[PDB]
Design a protein around this ligand. Structure first.
Ligand SMILES: *[C@@H]1O[C@H](CO)[C@@H](O[C@@H]2O[C@H](CO)[C@@H](O)[C@H](O)[C@H]2NC(C)=O)[C@H](O)[C@H]1NC(C)=O
Ligand SMILES: *[C@@H]1O[C@H](CO)[C@@H](O[C@@H]2O[C@H](CO)[C@@H](O)[C@H](O)[C@H]2NC(C)=O)[C@H](O)[C@H]1NC(C)=O
Ligand SMILES: *[C@@H]1O[C@H](CO)[C@@H](O[C@@H]2O[C@H](CO)[C@@H](O)[C@H](O)[C@H]2NC(C)=O)[C@H](O)[C@H]1NC(C)=O
Ligand SMILES: *[C@@H]1O[C@H](CO)[C@@H](O)[C@H](O)[C@H]1NC(C)=O
Ligand SMILES: *[C@@H]1O[C@H](CO)[C@@H](O)[C@H](O)[C@H]1NC(C)=O
Ligand SMILES: *[C@@H]1O[C@H](CO)[C@@H](O)[C@H](O)[C@H]1NC(C)=O
Ligand SMILES: *[C@@H]1O[C@H](CO)[C@@H](O)[C@H](O)[C@H]1NC(C)=O
Lengths: 248, 232, 281, 49, 49
């Protein structure tokens, strides 16, 4: 029933899951096995979280190595200042060392602030994707998964989160003859859902995403104009399902 | 990289500068203790014009100056044109070419063949600024790769659409190519027809998003002074 | 060598600038290369009475860009010479990976997908469909039935052609409408010009020229004055790189918004209020 | 005027109140400020067989 | 927090004039009065930096 809900948002009626339910479940489990193999094989898949770890480690290891920097002083060891100098130049060397180390600390804090703004933007995006695809279904195109969205599963990760987007892609194409409306005895028929398809001899309605022909009746079409108003209109006798019921 | 293992990609290295070929001094035709030389145009030399030293490619410029105006400057007030004391026509000064140097190589996990990129510099002077595989690009000169007209997905980006890949060439070598943007597909529009697929599949993809980073905190006196009381 | 005593500032400045530079190409790739295949223009041009001929690429051009694209490329004033003096002081400009010919081909592919296939070109294979039902279901995507545009196909077609002509006249007549891109070029130009002009600042030393200090003074006091000059110039360079990082965060936010605009309004029909212009999209 | 109609959101296209375009819920006592109509059924006169 | 950030930033900008930054005094005119101009501009240089 959850799959019947997720198909209902992407232009698919409820019956189409159950008509391919074993095949849909088998393809889903095969894709889970494929992504198990992809995560077991590709050690370079987790680029962004390893990049976050590398960013933090590189920033700390370049702040720590700035303690050995002289910043133009005699040395970065303060006891050389305190043991081989008089105080009038020792305070100058202290000023140079403290100004240099404080400048490096300011640079590190500025880099952490900029990267914290970037990480906060990514975390707001991740919280939005959490609330829109784990807590719901994303109606926005190419937000969670390329194609029609079905689910997304949150998975924990070091300094991040990983989503498993389950998508919906049509695969096997075919072409059919169409009309914007079909006029039967002066009544232009506008379909409530679906587009008119013609296989060459007969006219059918069919959903825009997968192939599902049904005979054009008065139940799936509505009339609000004559033959003249619709440009590109063709003729077919719209069959009435009431007609066998009239003969009952 | 301070590492014994270098992975696949393009990596910045130490840059290169075109050094001056000669030194040119110009003096009026009483000068100082040093004496002037002959003029050299359209080549990278040191220049001197009545004490205005430097290194630049002196040109065959046709700039018109006012008779008192001995020098000129750019929009950022950098000296671009001078009046030579020997010849009062104006010579535009452009200091010599240079650029960053990028090494395009597959990883040392795989191979150790090296292609070198010289960013923004023309191949007419790069290998003497050793060659044997030279491709000229608007983005810059390329040493150690052979251009191939076959378009593929971008392996290692270079610039201006050119990408370099490591393929057997009939043997392994580094080859550059114009990138492929994909395949080509013509959809015949006709208002008599639609196209609706018949069979649909289910697929699973992956998205990775950082959420947080490492929390840190810094003690003032321990970091800056390292437990010295008079420093504190 | 006296810059080496300050240590690892230069390496992290180069790392930050390279992290900006790769991010620019990543922004261009994630904005434009959202489509798998380069779709081409079909020969049948009756697009339900519409006129897409000048947003589609002009075949008579040497670099086959569209007409409105040529207008936008002609309206922007560009630092060409402004590139001379900044080049001579160690500042370089790297060429972008995706040249404007390939951006034109990518936009042509996105146009051919959107026109000949609706929004199905972003999910799987592009497939042909006419415009009466296409704009009718997009009219059904905004809350009105499909029959209205079957009645008024020609009126809506000439309305869209008149809107295209008005946009053509506005982008032929106004160069100042492209404010933000001209702001980007002007900001980069003034940042580079301010960076070059801050070499002339003495920073409290006896001169802003290094040879004047180095060639005459004794070694200790010359080292002091060069330390003053290096401190001033490195503070200027750090301020420049920090402002470039903040501007890179702003440009990243704008490029992420533009990629979302592409993926939601070019590859689909947005239901968000006032996300893709006032009125129903 | 005097003819109550169902109308789309963005375009004034009035249609007569039929069971094909309306659905039924509740009796006519709890709802607020509601009016009368002779609701047509297009399928109803076709059943005479 | 926005108001307190503004007030705290302005106040922290205010009290750093009291910080001597390795110069002899926080007040500039005391350095101008006590010393002649040559070492005075060095002390003012440290203060301005
Ligand atoms: C839709 O496509 C799938 C494959 O993507 C079809 O499943 C295959 O069906 C054949 C014949 O029934 C089997 O031999 C295969 O083992 C199935 N699986 C695969 C992975 O190929 C499915 O039958 C198609 N459905 C329709 C209605 O055409
Ligand atoms: C679609 O609009 C364009 C732009 O107005 C039309 O192209 C012009 O056509 C006229 C007549 O052939 C030429 O004189 C102009 O030079 C063209 N301008 C450009 C920019 O190409 C085009 O003809 C229109 N198409 C249709 C079918 O009406
Ligand atoms: C609705 O608005 C459209 C857009 O303005 C109207 O179409 C214009 O009508 C005037 C008056 O008849 C004509 O001069 C214009 O040439 C029409 N525009 C085009 C592009 O042809 C339309 O008349 C309005 N009313 C209705 C009922 O649709
Ligand atoms: C079209 O479909 C009808 C089903 O009503 C069938 O009888 C006819 O043979 C089909 N024609 C073709 C050309 O497939
Ligand atoms: C359908 O396409 C043909 C061929 O281009 C064209 O002549 C015809 O006018 C089109 N019909 C409609 C209704 O667009
Ligand atoms: C549909 O029928 C009308 C007459 O009722 C006729 O004029 C018209 O040509 C027919 N349509 C086609 C496509 O033949
Ligand atoms: C390289 O130099 C030659 C002559 O020096 C010139 O003709 C050519 O256009 C240059 N290459 C580029 C890409 O500008």
């Amino acid at each position: 029933m959850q799959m019947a809900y997720r198909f209902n948002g992407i232009g698919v009626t409820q019956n189409v899951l159950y008509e391919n339910q074993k095949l849909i479940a088998n393809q889903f489990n095969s894709a889970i096995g494929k992504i198990q193999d992809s995560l077991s094989s590709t050690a370079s898949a987790l680029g962004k979280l390893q990049d976050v770890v590398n960013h933090n480690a590189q920033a700390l290891n370049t702040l720590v190595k700035q303690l050995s920097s002289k910043f133009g002083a005699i040395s970065s060891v303060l006891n050389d200042i305190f043991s081989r100098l008089d105080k009038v130049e020792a305070e100058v060397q202290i000023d140079r060392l403290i100004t240099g180390r404080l400048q490096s600390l300011q640079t590190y804090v500025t880099q952490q602030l900029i990267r914290a703004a970037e990480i906060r933007a990514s975390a707001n995006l991740a919280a939005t994707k959490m609330s829109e695809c784990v807590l719901g279904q994303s109606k926005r195109v190419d937000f969670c998964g390329k194609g029609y969205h079905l689910m997304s599963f949150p998975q924990s990760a070091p300094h991040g989160v990983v989503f498993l987007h389950v998508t919906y892609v049509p695969a096997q194409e075919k072409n059919f003859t169409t009309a914007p409306a079909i006029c039967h005895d002066g009544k232009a028929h506008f379909p409530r859902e679906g587009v008119f398809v013609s296989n060459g001899t007969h006219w059918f309605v069919t959903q825009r995403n997968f192939y599902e022909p049904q005979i054009i009746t008065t139940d799936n079409t509505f009339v609000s104009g004559n033959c003249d108003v619709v440009i590109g209109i063709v003729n077919n006798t719209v069959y009435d399902p009431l007609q066998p019921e009239l003969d009952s | 990289l301070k590492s014994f293992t270098v992975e696949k990609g393009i990596y910045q290295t130490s840059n290169f500068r075109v050094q001056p070929t000669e030194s040119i001094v110009r003096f009026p035709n009483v000068c100082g203790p040093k004496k002037s030389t002959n003029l050299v145009k359209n080549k990278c030399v040191n220049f001197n014009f009545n004490g205005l030293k430097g290194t630049g490619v002196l040109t065959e410029s046709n700039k018109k100056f006012l008779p008192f105006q001995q020098f000129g400057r750019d929009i950022a007030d950098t000296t671009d044109a001078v009046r030579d004391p020997q010849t009062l026509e104006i010579l535009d000064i452009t200091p010599c070419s240079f650029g960053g140097v990028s090494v395009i190589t597959p990883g040392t996990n795989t191979s150790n063949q090296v292609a070198v990129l010289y960013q923004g510099v023309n191949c007419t002077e790069v290998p003497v600024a050793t060659g044997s595989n030279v491709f000229q690009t608007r983005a810059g000169c390329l040493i150690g790769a052979e251009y191939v007209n076959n378009s593929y997905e971008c392996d290692i980006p270079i610039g201006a659409g050119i990408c370099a890949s490591y393929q057997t060439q009939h043997s392994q070598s580094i080859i550059a190519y114009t990138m492929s943007l994909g395949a080509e597909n013509s959809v015949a529009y006709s208002n008599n027809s639609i196209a609706i697929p018949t069979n649909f599949t289910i697929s699973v993809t992956t998205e990775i998003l950082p959420v947080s980073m490492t929390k840190t905190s810094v003690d003032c006196t321990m970091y800056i002074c390292g437990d010295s009381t008079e420093c504190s | 060598n006296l810059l080496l005593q300050y240590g690892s500032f230069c390496t992290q400045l180069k790392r930050a600038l390279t992290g900006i530079a790769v991010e620019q190409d990543k922004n261009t790739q994630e904005v434009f290369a959202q489509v798998k295949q380069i779709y081409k223009t079909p020969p049948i041009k009756y697009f339900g009475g519409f006129n897409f001929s000048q947003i589609l690429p002009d075949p008579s051009k040497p670099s086959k860009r569209s007409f409105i694209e040529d207008l936008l490329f002609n309206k922007v004033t560009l630092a060409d010479d402004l590139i001379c003096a900044q080049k001579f002081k160690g500042l370089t400009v790297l060429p972008p990976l995706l040249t404007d010919e390939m951006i034109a081909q990518y936009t042509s592919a996105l146009l051919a997908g959107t026109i000949t296939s609706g929004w199905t070109f972003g999910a799987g294979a592009a497939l042909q469909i006419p415009f009466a039902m296409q704009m009718a279901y997009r009219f059904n995507g905004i809350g009105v039935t499909q029959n209205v545009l079957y009645e008024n196909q020609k009126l809506i077609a000439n309305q869209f052609n008149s809107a295209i002509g008005k946009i053509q006249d506005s982008l032929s007549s106004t160069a100042s409408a492209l404010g933000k891109l001209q702001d980007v070029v002007n900001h980069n130009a003034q940042a580079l010009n301010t960076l070059v002009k801050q070499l002339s600042s003495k920073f409290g030393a006896i001169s802003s020229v290094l040879n004047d200090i180095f060639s005459r003074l004794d070694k200790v006091e010359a080292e002091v004055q060069i330390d003053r000059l290096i401190t001033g110039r490195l503070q200027s360079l750090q301020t420049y790189v920090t402002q470039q990082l903040i501007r890179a965060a702003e440009i990243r936010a704008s490029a992420n918004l533009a990629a979302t605009k592409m993926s939601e309004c070019v590859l689909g029909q947005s239901k968000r209020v006032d996300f893709c212009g006032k009125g129903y999209h």
